[PDB]
Amino acid sequence: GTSSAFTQIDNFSHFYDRGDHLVNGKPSFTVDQVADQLTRSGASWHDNDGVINLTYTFLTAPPVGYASRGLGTFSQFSALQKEQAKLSLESWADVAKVTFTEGPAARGDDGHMTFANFSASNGGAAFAYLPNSSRKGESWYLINKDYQVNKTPGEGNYGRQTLTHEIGHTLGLSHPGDNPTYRDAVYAEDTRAYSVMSYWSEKNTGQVFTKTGEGAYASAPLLDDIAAVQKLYGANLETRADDTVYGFNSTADRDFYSATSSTDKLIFSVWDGGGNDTLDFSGFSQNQKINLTAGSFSDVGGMTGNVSIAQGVTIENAIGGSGNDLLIGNDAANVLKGGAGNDIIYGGGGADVLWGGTGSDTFVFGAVSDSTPKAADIIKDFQSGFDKIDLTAITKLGGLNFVDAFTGHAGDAIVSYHQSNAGSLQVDFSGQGVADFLVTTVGQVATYDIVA
Ligand SMILES: [Ca+2]
Ligand SMILES: [Ca+2]
Ligand SMILES: [Ca+2]
Ligand SMILES: [Ca+2]
Ligand SMILES: [Ca+2]
Ligand SMILES: [Ca+2]
Numbered sequence: 001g002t003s004s005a006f007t008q009i010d011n012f013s014h015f016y017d018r019g020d021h022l023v024n025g026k027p028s029f030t031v032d033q034v035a036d037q038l039t040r041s042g043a044s045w046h047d048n049d050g051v052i053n054l055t056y057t058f059l060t061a062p063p064v065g066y067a068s069r070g071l072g073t074f075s076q077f078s079a080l081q082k083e084q085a086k087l088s089l090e091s092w093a094d095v096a097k098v099t100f101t102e103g104p105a106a107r108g109d110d111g112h113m114t115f116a117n118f119s120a121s122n123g124g125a126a127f128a129y130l131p132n133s134s135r136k137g138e139s140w141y142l143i144n145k146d147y148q149v150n151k152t153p154g155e156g157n158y159g160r161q162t163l164t165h166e167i168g169h170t171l172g173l174s175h176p177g178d179n180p181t182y183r184d185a186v187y188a189e190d191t192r193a194y195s196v197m198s199y200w201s202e203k204n205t206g207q208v209f210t211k212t213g214e215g216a217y218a219s220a221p222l223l224d225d226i227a228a229v230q231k232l233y234g235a236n237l238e239t240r241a242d243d244t245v246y247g248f249n250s251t252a253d254r255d256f257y258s259a260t261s262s263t264d265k266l267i268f269s270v271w272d273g274g275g276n277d278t279l280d281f282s283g284f285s286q287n288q289k290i291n292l293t294a295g296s297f298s299d300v301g302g303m304t305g306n307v308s309i310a311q312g313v314t315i316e317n318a319i320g321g322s323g324n325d326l327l328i329g330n331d332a333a334n335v336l337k338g339g340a341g342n343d344i345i346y347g348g349g350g351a352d353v354l355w356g357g358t359g360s361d362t363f364v365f366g367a368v369s370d371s372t373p374k375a376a377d378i379i380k381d382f383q384s385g386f387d388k389i390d391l392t393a394i395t396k397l398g399g400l401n402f403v404d405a406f407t408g409h410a411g412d413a414i415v416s417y418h419q420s421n422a423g424s425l426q427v428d429f430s431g432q433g434v435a436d437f438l439v440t441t442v443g444q445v446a447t448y449d450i451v452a
């Protein structure tokens with residue numbers, strides 16, 4: 001078999017797998033299947049210039065016919081609502097080729113949106129209309145003594161998510177399905193771990209974002225929302241196309257991608273147009289599981305299934321926190337830093353740069369192609385006697401034959417050291433008489449530091 005360390009990596013890499021199986025008695029839909037589900041109405045703004053340009057207005061007065069809507073007292077968005085709305089708009093503009101510009105309807109635009117508040121509960125907490133309706137672009141928000149959620153929207157709270165959600169609706173995203181409960185959902189991933197359009201809590205899919213008495217809501221489009229809006233309007237490859245850090249020490253310039261404290265509750269899906277990117281979760285003390293696979297989920301900041309990388313996005317680096325984390329790279333050359341604590345790092349393909357950090361770390365390899373002589377991983381701070389190079393997924397615990405020179409026998413391995421403080425582990429898995437696997441290190445590696 002393999003070690004527990006490999007099994008932990010493998011299990012996590014597949015933990016959130018989607019499609020072709022039932023979950024909660026419902027079909028599991030892949031992100032693409034959900035993108036179809038979320039755009040099933042066929043409604044969308046139309047271009048052309050290749051980009052949809054919408055204008056929007058925070059109404060200062062009730063439109064003609066307003067009183068017949070039964071919404072009660074009309075009121076303009078406060079400065080705080082406008083500020084948050086603009087952030088929500090931006091979060092959609094960031095991922096899809098649609099822009100929002102404050103201003104009255106204009107002949108040159110592709111559509112016009114309005115925002116305003118109403119006071120009569122009978123209207124609902126908030127609502128919006130699809131872009132093919134007579135009230136295309138409109139979204140309305142309830143505010144009265146009995147319902148105060150929309151009066152103070154802010155990063156992470158439902159008021160901000162409501163703005164994001166209603167706008168997603170004005171863009172053409174439907175709610176995931178048609179007292180209903182998650183039981184009536186069409187597919188398993190109909191929860192707010194996957195889409196801000198869902199009415200159901202992440203608890204239904206097992207993720208944990210917060211506890212009773214506290215609110216925790218993604219302020220920006222989540223994984224499936226990004227796929228859905230991009231299916232409608234095209235991916236916006238221009239955003240953050242330069243090098244970007246998400247999380248702690250964020251350089252994304254977005255409130256929902258920034259962490260400044262260990263208690264921060266991050267719930268976001270990373271969209272990026274290119275650049276050597278990093279997921280920095282160094283400031284957390286809780287166990288984390290970071291997956292750099294595109295379209296995959298990570299357990300971050302003491303929560304689970306709360307961070308994801310959008311389909312089509314390549315993230316190159318990850319920095320774990322002080323807990324005992326799992327770090328999973330992708331095919332690209334990744335720089336993975338464990339942090340304090342005992343981490344299990346799996347570079348994947350390409351020539352990775354691995355930092356175990358303090359603590360006792362395990363560097364897992366699941367295939368020979370993971371670390372070849374022509375593209376060898378380098379463990380930058382290997383600590384003999386504490387860290388481990390785990391090849392059990394390859395050897396299946398068959399063991400290795402440590403020799404000073406390859407004999408032509410499969411399984412022969414050579415541990416070397418150069419007193420540039422550089423070590424290396426070479427292996428001839430295929431038995432060709434030469435190394436087909438190579439891992440270099442800064443710091444000595446001993447035969448007893450290898451699990452095979
Ligand atoms: Ca970038
Ligand atoms: Ca990148
Ligand atoms: Ca760590
Ligand atoms: Ca890699
Ligand atoms: Ca590798
Ligand atoms: Ca460590």
